Swiss-Prot record:
Induction info: Expression of the gene is regulated by the two-component regulatory system SsrA/SsrB. It is also activated by SlyA and controlled by the two-component regulatory system PhoP/PhoQ. Expressed in host macrophages and when grown in an acidic environment.
Organism: Salmonella typhimurium (strain LT2 / SGSC1412 / ATCC 700720)
Role summary: Effector proteins function to alter host cell physiology and promote bacterial survival in host tissues. Involved in the reorganization of late endosome/lysosome (LE/Lys) compartments in mammalian cells. Necessary and sufficient to link kinesin-1 onto the Salmonella-containing vacuole (SCV) membrane. Required for centrifugal extension of lysosomal glycoprotein-rich membrane tubules, known as Salmonella-induced filaments (Sifs), away from the SCV and toward the cell periphery. Required for virulence, but not for intracellular survival and replication in phagocytic cells.
Subcellular location: Secreted; Host membrane
Domain commentary: Contains various tandem pentapeptide repeats in the C-terminal region. The pentapeptide motif is required to efficiently recruit kinesin-1. No position is completely conserved in these repeats, whose consensus sequence is A-[DN]-[FLM]-X-X. The C-terminal 38 amino acid residues, specifically, the C-terminal motif LFNEF, are required for peripheral localization of PipB2 and redistribution of lysosomal-associated membrane protein (LAMP). The N-terminal 225 amino acid residues are sufficient for type III translocation and association with Sifs and SCVs, but not accumulation in peripheral vesicles.
Self-association and partners: Interacts with the host kinesin light chain (KLC), a subunit of the kinesin-1 motor complex.
Protein name as it appears in the record: Secreted effector protein PipB2
Length: 120
């Protein structure tokens, strides 16, 4: 049967996916091959966020679960007031695979605000 749709999508590496996520929150909007791949990130995040948000501008969620990101589970962990790093811990995983990295809270949060505002 035709049940290799997610199996086709998952052909990418979870580390590679993590990297383009990092590249998005640092500088997203290149006009080579960036547009489509990152567009999927924009819409998936924008929708899952506004779905757990009242509308826009309010306190955005601390854990953003994206289990189906290129067949890879990624969990965005926003730091609390007692956290000394003040950075976002991104955790992408894929069965035997696991990858963890940090990005500035300023970058992730401002893009996530602008993403809710981009939806309007």
């Amino acid at each position: 049967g035709a049940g290799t749709s997610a199996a086709m999508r998952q052909a990418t590496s979870p580390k590679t996916i993590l990297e383009y996520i990092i590249n998005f929150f640092t500088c997203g909007g290149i006009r080579r091959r960036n547009e489509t791949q990152y567009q999927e990130l924009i819409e998936t995040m924008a929708e899952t966020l506004k779905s757990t948000m009242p509308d826009r501008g309010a306190p955005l969620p601390e854990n953003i679960i994206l289990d189906d990101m290129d067949g890879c589970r990624v969990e965005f962990n926003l730091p609390g007031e007692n956290n000394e790093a003040g950075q976002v811990i991104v955790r992408v995983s894929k069965g035997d695979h696991s990858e963890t990295r940090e990005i500035p809270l300023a970058s992730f949060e401002k893009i996530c605000r602008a993403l809710l505002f981009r939806c309007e």
